[PDB]
Amino acid sequence: TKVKYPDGFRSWYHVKSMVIQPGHPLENPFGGIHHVYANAEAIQGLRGGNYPDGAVLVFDLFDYQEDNHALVEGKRKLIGVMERDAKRFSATGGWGYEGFGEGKPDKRLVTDGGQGCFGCHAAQKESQYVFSRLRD
Amino acid sequence: TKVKYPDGFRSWYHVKSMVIQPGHPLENPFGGIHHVYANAEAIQGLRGGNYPDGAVLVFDLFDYQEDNHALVEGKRKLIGVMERDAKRFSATGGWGYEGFGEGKPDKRLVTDGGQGCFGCHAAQKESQYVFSRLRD
Numbered sequence: 001t002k003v004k005y006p007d008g009f010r011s012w013y014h015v016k017s018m019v020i021q022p023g024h025p026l027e028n029p030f031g032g033i034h035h036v037y038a039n040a041e042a043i044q045g046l047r048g049g050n051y052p053d054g055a056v057l058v059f060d061l062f063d064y065q066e067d068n069h070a071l072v073e074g075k076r077k078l079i080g081v082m083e084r085d086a087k088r089f090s091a092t093g094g095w096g097y098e099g100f101g102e103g104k105p106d107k108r109l110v111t112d113g114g115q116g117c118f119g120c121h122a123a124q125k126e127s128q129y130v131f132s133r134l135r136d
Numbered sequence: 137t138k139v140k141y142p143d144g145f146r147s148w149y150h151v152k153s154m155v156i157q158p159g160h161p162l163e164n165p166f167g168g169i170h171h172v173y174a175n176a177e178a179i180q181g182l183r184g185g186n187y188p189d190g191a192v193l194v195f196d197l198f199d200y201q202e203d204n205h206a207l208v209e210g211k212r213k214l215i216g217v218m219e220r221d222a223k224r225f226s227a228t229g230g231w232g233y234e235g236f237g238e239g240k241p242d243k244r245l246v247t248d249g250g251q252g253c254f255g256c257h258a259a260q261k262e263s264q265y266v267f268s269r270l271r272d
């Protein structure tokens with residue numbers, strides 16, 4: 001019951017972005033510029049509908065470089081994936097969690113069935129474990 | 137003669153993002169977090185083809201707030217638009233340039249036929265006047 005690599009995610013809907021800089025409590029490991037993407041099924045869930053199985057959210061994390069009062073995207077550090085499967089992933093709330101180092105399909109990171117990822121997202125039980133909100 | 141408001145641009149492919157902070161040359165009026173979106177026709181040009189008529193790039197500009205060393209997106213300040221049409225927009229290199237205040241259709245910002253936008257973009261003559269490059 002592994003989470004699939006989300007092929008083609010870069011074509012998906014861009015939900016939002018945030019920058020985490022040194023000093024912030026999530027600097028390790030989430031420091032950098034990140035972008036959140038969602039496929040069609042996740043949008044139904046984000047819109048205030050419910051999440052169909054098959055919904056996928058991606059957190060795409062880049063290192064940044066400071067260039068004359070601009071922050072410029074550098075190398076991809078990793079992508080984080082949540083894949084909705086109420087029955088397959090019922091142990092962590094109906095979402096499977098995986099990380100891919102540098103976004104590579106062969107660099108799977110999660111060793112504990114996603115319990116560590118879930119421990120934090122569990123704080124968002126109310127929104128079905130998703131922190132991101134749709135915007136305009 | 138007028139650049140069309142790009143309805144539905146938020147659905148399009150997210151090319152890249154960048155943060156421009158106070159002190160940067162472009163702070164006024166491009167300061168903030170911006171995201172670049174391309175429709176299907178613009179992707180063809182970004183990937184190395186010619187840009188077809190009908191190609192559209194949008195620069196989506198948000199204010200941000202610094203909160204405990206995170207930069208969080210706030211309100212949309214404006215969108216900048218480039219619309220390809222080699223004949224109609226011949227005076228400005230075949231792209232028409234428009235700004236929409238707060239991303240609203242009724243708030244047109246350009247008052248000089250796009251000459252001011254064109255003058256800086258002319259530096260990228262070699263890449264069909266587009267600064268952004270596809271990344272993975």
Ligand code: HEC
Nearest residue numbers: 018036057058059080081082097098099117120130131132
């Ligand atoms: C708190 C200590 C966290 C841990 C550990 C993990 N995540 Fe998380 N995640 C966190 C926050 C605050 C956010 C929102 C960021 C924003 O821009 O608002 C996220 C977001 C995700 C997303 C995007 C979907 C969403 O819930 O907003 C994904 C796909 C995601 N996170 C996956 C993920 C994985 C795979 C983790 C373990 C390897 C993981 N997260 C841990 C907070 C925390």
Ligand code: HEC
Nearest residue numbers: 154193194195216217218233234235252253256266267268
């Ligand atoms: C230099 C003095 C500029 C002026 C005046 C304008 N633009 Fe521009 N633009 C500039 C840069 C350096 C970039 C790249 C930003 C990045 O993230 O790399 C941009 C980008 C755009 C885009 C995105 C497509 C691209 O060329 O990369 C659009 C749609 C765009 N700019 C529109 C635009 C309009 C409408 C302007 C006058 C109101 C305008 N720009 C001025 C540099 C400069």
Ligand SMILES: [Zn+2]
Nearest residue numbers: 068069159160
């Ligand atoms: Zn300076």
